């Protein structure tokens, strides 16, 4: 499956997930994510949820 625009709830799985596995390990965190891959949620994270 291939998803468009983030939505809340995504957002906040990536947030708990990143606290088990860290900012890291991007391609098991994805597999928890249904129509998104490692990149993306890599991107997800240091562009818009954990900002420099
Ligand atoms: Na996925």
Redesign the pocket.
Known sequence: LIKGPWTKEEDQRVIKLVQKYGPKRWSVI????????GKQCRERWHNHLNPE
């Open positions: 994805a597999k928890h994510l249904k129509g998104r891959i």
